[PDB]
Amino acid sequence: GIKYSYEIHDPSKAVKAKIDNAKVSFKKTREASCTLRRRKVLDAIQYLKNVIAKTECVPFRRYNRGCGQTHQARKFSIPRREIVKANGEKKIKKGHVQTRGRWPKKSAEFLISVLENIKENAETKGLDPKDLVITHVQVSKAPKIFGRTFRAHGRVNPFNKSPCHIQMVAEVLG
Amino acid sequence: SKGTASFGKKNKRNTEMCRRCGRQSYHKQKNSCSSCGYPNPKMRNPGSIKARRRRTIGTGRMRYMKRELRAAKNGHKGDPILRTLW
RNA sequence: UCUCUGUUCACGGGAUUGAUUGGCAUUAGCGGCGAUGAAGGACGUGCAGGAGGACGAUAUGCGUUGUUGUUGUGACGGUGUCUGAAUUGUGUGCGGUGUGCACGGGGACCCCUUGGACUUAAGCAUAUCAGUAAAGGGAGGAGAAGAAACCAAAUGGG
RNA sequence: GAAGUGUGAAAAGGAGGAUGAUGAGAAAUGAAAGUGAAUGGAGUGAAUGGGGGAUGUUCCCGCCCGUCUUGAAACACGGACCAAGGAGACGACGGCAGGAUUGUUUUCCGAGAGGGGAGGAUGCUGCGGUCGGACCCGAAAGAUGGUGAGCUAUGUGUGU
RNA sequence: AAAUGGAAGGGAUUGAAUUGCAUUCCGAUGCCUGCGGGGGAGUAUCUGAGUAAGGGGGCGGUAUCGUUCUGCUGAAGGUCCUGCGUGAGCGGGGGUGGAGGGGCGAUAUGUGCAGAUCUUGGUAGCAGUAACAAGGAAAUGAUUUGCGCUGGACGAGG
RNA sequence: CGCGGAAGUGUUUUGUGCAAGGGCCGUAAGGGAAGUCGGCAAGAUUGAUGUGUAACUUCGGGAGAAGGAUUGGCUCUAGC
RNA sequence: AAAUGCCUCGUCAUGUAAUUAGUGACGCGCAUGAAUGGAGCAACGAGAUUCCCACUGUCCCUACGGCCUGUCUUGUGAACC
RNA sequence: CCAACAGGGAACGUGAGCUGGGUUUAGACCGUCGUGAGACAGGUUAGUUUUACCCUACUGUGUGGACUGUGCAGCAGAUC
């Protein structure tokens, strides 16, 4: 099927999981996964369960035209930094305040399924699921699925789905 | 109201299955098939160039004419029993 | 983080290269349907079956003969529901109440009837396209034609 | 009145994931448009280009192509993006040019009555001319032969 | 004396916007001078813009006949890097791929694309936007309670 | 018929609580068509029973002309 | 001076504070007129016009309130250009 | 009535702002003209007003304390 784009060095410490042609919106699922890397595997499962209860939000950064504003999104702001010696010259970099977020909740169930498979694959190799770190997440586009809808004056237009593929790799950083 | 609303009145059927050709084109008030022309003894002249190759010799089974063609390659010898009488 | 732009890996789509039990052309033979019920149509047939193909109540096949031991097959003969010219009819010959023949299918090429307009004339009416297309009737492996009430003006041909 | 051909020499085998097995090979090849992940550089200037220099920029020059037109950057028309397909070829008859083979070539004037000696032929390639669907795509119409009163209009039989 | 705030090109300038001068200087792809390339010319040389249009010399696709080579010790195609040519284009190297591919002379052509509101197929931005759905409840729900108004038969059509 | 009820039949159980601007409606001091091409739109009259009814007129009509009055609940009387 | 009159907002009277409107009267009428039918309105008209009473958010000049949308969430998820 | 009731420009400012009275294809009447089909800048009556969710402009809003200085931009009272 679909191949991994990550090269796993030291394959005794890694774990993998996949889903091909998942029946979930590609754009919403790609936003929900954009803060998962470098988290602990058990802290990313609790973070996605608070998104379903609506106590933490998902930051909307790329596919976000006309999204709602909320106070929970200010936790992902980028601070003002100093960039010394671009090419020998020091410069200054303003920050960004986030302000846009949402609570998808069907993308969050799909990502919890993939994270549970990685947790049961670590048991067979006998390593501690409290020591896993997420080192790789990728959400891609899958082929379209066709449908239809009725418009005024006896017309028909397309009415389609946009699914996706999901991969993940986890590692022990000893 | 000559559009959508006029379509809800179209529940009468004028035709039935023709007993010569098998299409839904035997008009009952006219007593006439619009495809093959039944009950005229001859079949109707086709209405288009393609219509000639949809129903002709060879588009069905040819149950007898195939047999006769195998018999004319061997001089039409018949049943070997009856050959004494002939 | 976002926007633009290098690099590497993974997608998305089906171009390109190479194949082909298919198509297309020219040439040589043949041109083999029907009241002894055709072509076409409807419905059926396998122990376990829908499509297609095959087959007809002798139904997913029977007999004879060749080759086989196989899911077996070739060449020839028999059977063929209900329909359809579809006729237990209509017309007509020979007889004197018996017994024949015609009808439908196909029509590229052939014989007879009927018969356009687009188009060209830088316009358009005679003219042209053209006695051609379309329509109808009648035949065959071809058909039609054919043995001078001819051609001519030589030392005549046939 | 369509669209749709390909696992392999062998099924030796797969089809949620992971761990694996078989095979020469995971399995026809797999471009562009467009996208995801990681990592390097730059930016708050529409972008892109040429000269001259350089591991991005700093100086100079530079309005969007095709087309009709006296005249287009145009408040003239076509063009969101990529692949593949897509338009002066063929026949007949004549002329000329270049080339090949051979050369012992010629029925004249005039309406007629009458009068009376003066190098071509057969192929091959190209260009100009005419008729052919005639460089490619495009009318409003005309004619021949057939289909319809299940919508709707009028008459008539029989019901509500 | 005119209708958005505005123009000796601008900031400015009392001569840096007037007049008269030249003994200095700057400034083209034009001129002179040394090399290189093309085309003419009677061979010591002379001469290069160009739409419509016409002529000469070259590059490339697919095949035929005719000659001459290469591939499982890894061909074509495809991708990245690199050499040669004024150019059309032609070579080599490393991955991928798993079966064929070329040079030279004459000959046959359905012989080269950015456009035609071109044809067919695939794909972006717009945009997770417009539009639509989320029907009163009781941890449970064959029990309790709240709301809406068509309900039951024959024909056509299925 | 309208305005309300039966019978039979249909129906769910973790979206928000309501800015501007829309669609369909309600109430308004004092004035009373000054609005507008134009009383468009809205407001107004409305059932029944006594009373009272003009010009004109094809003598049939006009006519419910116009204009004025009465109306609930309770307890009784009179007629057939 | 009419759904027929160019000149033309004809001239006189009447309705208003004010009348290119309406009605009455006048007539050399660009170009009225007799089944091309002329004159004429009882009854009838979702026909075209002008005025009176009544009534009012039409307006002076706007205010406040209701329900459904919009604003905010989850799911499904186009098009024009 | 008034202090006074000046004159003009902005795609003869302004229809994805409205309205649709003029103009206003297809129905109809009258007058004049034409043998006729029909004609008239002659009169009369009846006659569909589509789509923003994109870029910019403009209005607010967001872009991370407390007390203040000083530059820039806006600018209001008029008449009896």
Ligand SMILES: [Zn+2]
């Ligand atoms: Zn038939």
